[PDB]
Amino acid sequence: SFVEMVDNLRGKSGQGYYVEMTVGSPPQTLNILVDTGSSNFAVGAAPHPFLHRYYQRQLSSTYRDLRKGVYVPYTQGKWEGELGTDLVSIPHGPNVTVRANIAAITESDKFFINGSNWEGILGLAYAEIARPDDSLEPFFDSLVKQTHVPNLFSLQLCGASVGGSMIIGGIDHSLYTGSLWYTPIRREWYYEVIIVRVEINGQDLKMDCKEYNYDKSIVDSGTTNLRLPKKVFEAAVKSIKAASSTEKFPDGFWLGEQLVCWQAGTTPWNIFPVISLYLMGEVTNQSFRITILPQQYLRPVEDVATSQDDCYKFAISQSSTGTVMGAVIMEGFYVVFDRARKRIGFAVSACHVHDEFRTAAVEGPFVTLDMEDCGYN
């Protein structure tokens, strides 16, 4: 019954992927951003200039007030609101209805996006990072507790407006090719993983692998960019600068601010390197790698001039809170969040990015000694 969920995601570039849901009785239809980087289910519940619609608790006969406030500060954006429960369904999802915790957003700051077409957020990570605390059961835990939906979901995020699939409860084999490669979920809070090696155009960055995971590495469909700890970001930009020194770019481009353009169809993809991230595998001393094309980390953006140029932003940026494998990394891969078996799977997506001479790949096995040393403590 998974075919009913294929292509159930839509989005705008840089603005998240959303799935259609209903809350309340009678059902109120809302678009909900799918966010593996957080754990609160929250919806616009009061007028906002960027909300086309919002949750009206007054109109739902199944709404229950929890008489408790809540606020969530993200890296970018925050909101506050009132906790409650209500019945929730996913029209292009499993055929079930769950009573779920819902944060009714009454105020927000740089959270909703002008013309994004989504009105709420589905935090898919674990209770340990839920606000106000881990006693607020996340939506997916409630779904698994109340239905027969198996305890896993998979995300196929497709590139450049954008679409994809969230397979709730399983793996749809028509969405990927090759083998799935699995990395352990290190700890059930974020979807935390361990990066054991980084190569750019086949050359090892040769850093202490702890640097790659300082102070954590997470898989986050709710963050656009690949975000790297300061030391790793600097090594990577230096290497990417050198590989592309044929041309020169404003250094504000390398900070993710200034866009760069080329005459339509003449983007010099060949001068940008591929990035390989090696992940801890399932067996002793075994890892695997995912390879990222420049078409993923050069995110296309609208032309700032009166031309029909191809314009892009550098979609790698610096982090102070660990590595973030964001949507730009996930695009072109089929990513299986196998919560039941505490692992995350990667495979080449059916909607993989296309270079002329190169290909995004998931490859293994590799031998990597001392992988446990790569985790930060």
Instruction: List residues near ligand E6P by CB under 6 A.
Output: 15-16, 33, 35, 37-38, 72, 74-77, 111, 121, 129, 220, 222-224
Q: Which is nearer to ligand E6P, 35 or 309 (CB)?
A: 35
Question: Six-digit token pair at 208?
Answer: 């202490």
CB of 74 to ligand E6P, least distance (A): 4
The DSSP line for 121-159 is EEE-S-GGG-SS-TTS--HHHHHHHHS---S-EEEEE--
User: Closest separation between CB of residue 269 and ligand E6P, Å?
Assistant: 24
Cβ 363 to ligand E6P, closest distance in Å?
28
Closest CB to ligand E6P among residues 87, 315: 315
Our CB check for ligand E6P shows the closer of 74 and 269 to be 74
Among 141, 220, 309, 338, the one annotated catalytic: 220
Per the annotation, the verdict on 370 as an active-site residue is: no
List, in order, residues 6 or more apart from 292 with CB less than 8 Å away. 226, 274, 275, 276, 277, 329, 360
Q: What is the C-alpha separation between 295 and 21, in angstroms, rounded?
A: 31
Judged by CB, which is closer to ligand E6P: 132, or 170?
132
> Is 251 a catalytic site residue?
no
- How far, in Å, CA of 183 to CA of 210, rounded? 17
Q: Smaller CB distance to ligand E6P: residue 50 or 269? A: 50
Q: In whole angstroms, give the CA distance from residue 217 to residue 228.
A: 9
Nearest distance from residue 116's CB to ligand E6P, in Å? 7
Paired with 363 in beta bridges are 289
For residue 241, give the H/E element and its range. helix 230-243
Which one from 35, 141, 309, 338 is the annotated catalytic residue? Answer: 35
Other Cβ atoms closer than 10 A to 68: 11
What is the chain's Cα-based Rg? 21
Residue 261, helix vs strand vs coil: strand
The CB-of-72 to ligand E6P minimum distance in angstroms stands at 5
Q: Which residue is nearest to ligand E6P (CB)?
A: 37
Q: Is 221 exposed, middle or buried (0-12, 13-18, 19+ CB in 10 A)?
A: buried
Q: Which residues are catalytic?
A: 35, 220
